[PDB]
Amino acid sequence: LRIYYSPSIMHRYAVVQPLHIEELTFGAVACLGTFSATDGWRRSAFNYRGSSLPVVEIDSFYSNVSDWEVIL
Amino acid sequence: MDLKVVVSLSSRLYTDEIAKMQQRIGCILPLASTHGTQNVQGLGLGQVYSLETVPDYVSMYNYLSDCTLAVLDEVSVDSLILTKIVPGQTYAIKNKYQPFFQWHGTGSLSVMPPVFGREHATVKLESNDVDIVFPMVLPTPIAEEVLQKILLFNVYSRVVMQAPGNADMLDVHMHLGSVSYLGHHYELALPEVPGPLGLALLDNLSLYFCIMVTLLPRASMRLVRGLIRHEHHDLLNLFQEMVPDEIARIDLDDLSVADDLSRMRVMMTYLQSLASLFNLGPRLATAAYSQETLTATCW
Amino acid sequence: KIHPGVAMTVVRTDEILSENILFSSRASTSMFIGTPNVSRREARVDAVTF
């Protein structure tokens, strides 16, 4: 997560915004649950009112919500 | 439902090492792939831990969480029968490990690479030229302490590389290499050069350190100064009549309640993330244990 | 294209596809065959593995 958001951390931390005490928090992570490994990601079109969007579909999902953790 | 693991040897094991593997009966080890049939190369922690290579415990301790865990059941010359650990099943486990730290329900069992020794935890198989590195399992506070010892020695080694030698060296290796328990002392094997991924973990902790160091509450520092001046506890044993210089110059401002409230709130959000960072290991909760049989009922 | 002070040798390896013949005399191996087992495990929410 950190090495993913490193360019965005660079840009947002940049010069546009210096500091204030509430502004220090940056990101939040929560887990939605366990998915069967090696099944993969099933790509499908979503058609509404004559328009299409690419959508991934996840088979056999197991739901388990966790709390929020701060990342920075 | 019916978790069943049988691992086939290509050639029959020697008449000596069959006895040694029988001595290893009833022990957790991590395996590669969740299948009823496995080749011996995937089995055990052998392939990543090399005698030729400098040991990275952080790399091992990452690798073991990635593997699914298992328990040895039957040792034969032809094949090894193991049962596997599903997250939601309750298992009978017996403590047969050679260091023998006493187990209680107070801690969840944590599984670590063999930080103590190299040779004794491992069994070589020259019949099929591969090595089995059994993991070492320990209760929770000893595991936390040993991980702390490893990271602190990483930091002080990287510092002491261009520092004076004999004084700083012979002070550091006092009570960091050796963990002292009731009636006993044991020497941790620590890496000579820490280069991969331990320092990355320490960098990750220093990120949170640099963020938290701005948002500290002032009145607690005032309370520490007033306590170390007036009274004494074992919490206050580290500070004698001297006060460190930093705290007075951070102290000099007055107290405003809402600022300390906001600082406490942000630090409160952050410490849960640090609690997420410290674990890095599969934790198995202990609900029952019999000392006379050395037998726990894990979860 | 001036010759250097030394000469040189080259070593190569090659791989050849071969359709092979296997001969075996009669009754050379005794085989023991067991009852097969069928087990079930690790039921997904929409699947079961056997």
Curated annotation (Swiss-Prot), chain A:
Coiled coil: none
Annotated localization: Virion; Host nucleus
Family: Belongs to the herpesviridae TRX1 protein family.
Subunit comment: Interacts with TRX2, MCP and capsid vertex component 2/CVC2.
Stated role: Structural component of the T=16 icosahedral capsid. The capsid is composed of pentamers and hexamers of major capsid protein/MCP, which are linked together by heterotrimers called triplexes. These triplexes are formed by a single molecule of triplex protein 1/TRX1 and two copies of triplex protein 2/TRX2. Additionally, TRX1 is required for efficient transport of TRX2 to the nucleus, which is the site of capsid assembly.
Stated name of the protein: Triplex capsid protein 1
Organism: Epstein-Barr virus (strain B95-8)
Parent-protein residues present: 293 to 364 of 364
Swiss-Prot record, chain B:
Family membership: Belongs to the herpesviridae TRX2 protein family.
One CC-aspect GO term: host cell nucleus
Main localization (coarse): virion
Keywords: Capsid protein, Host nucleus, Virion
Compartment list: Virion; Host nucleus
Pfam families linked to this entry: Herpes_V23
Any one GO molecular-function label of the UniProt entry: structural molecule activity
Keyword Cell division listed: no
Subunit and interaction comment: Interacts with TRX1 and major capisd protein/MCP.
UniProt function note: Structural component of the T=16 icosahedral capsid. The capsid is composed of pentamers and hexamers of major capsid protein/MCP, which are linked together by heterotrimers called triplexes. These triplexes are formed by a single molecule of triplex protein 1/TRX1 and two copies of triplex protein 2/TRX2. Additionally, TRX1 is required for efficient transport of TRX2 to the nucleus, which is the site of capsid assembly.
Keyword Ion transport: no
Listed name of the protein: Triplex capsid protein 2
Lineage: Viruses, Duplodnaviria, Heunggongvirae, Peploviricota, Herviviricetes
Cited InterPro entries: Herpes_capsid_2
Curated annotation (Swiss-Prot), chain C:
Subcellular localization: Virion; Host nucleus
Subunit composition and interactions: Homomultimer. Makes the hexons and eleven out of twelve pentons. Interacts with triplex proteins 1/TRX1 and 2/TRX2; adjacent capsomers are linked together in groups of three by triplexes, heterotrimeric complexes composed of one molecule of TRX1 and two molecules of TRX2. Interacts with scaffold protein; this interaction allows efficient MCP transport to the host nucleus. Interacts with capsid vertex component 2/CVC2. Interacts with the small capsomere-interacting protein/SCP.
Function: Self-assembles to form an icosahedral capsid with a T=16 symmetry, about 200 nm in diameter, and consisting of 150 hexons and 12 pentons (total of 162 capsomers). Hexons form the edges and faces of the capsid and are each composed of six MCP molecules. In contrast, one penton is found at each of the 12 vertices. Eleven of the pentons are MCP pentamers, while the last vertex is occupied by the portal complex.
Family indicated by similarity: Belongs to the herpesviridae major capsid protein family.
Protein name per UniProt: Major capsid protein
Organism field: Epstein-Barr virus (strain B95-8) (HHV-4)
Gene that this polypeptide is encoded by: MCP
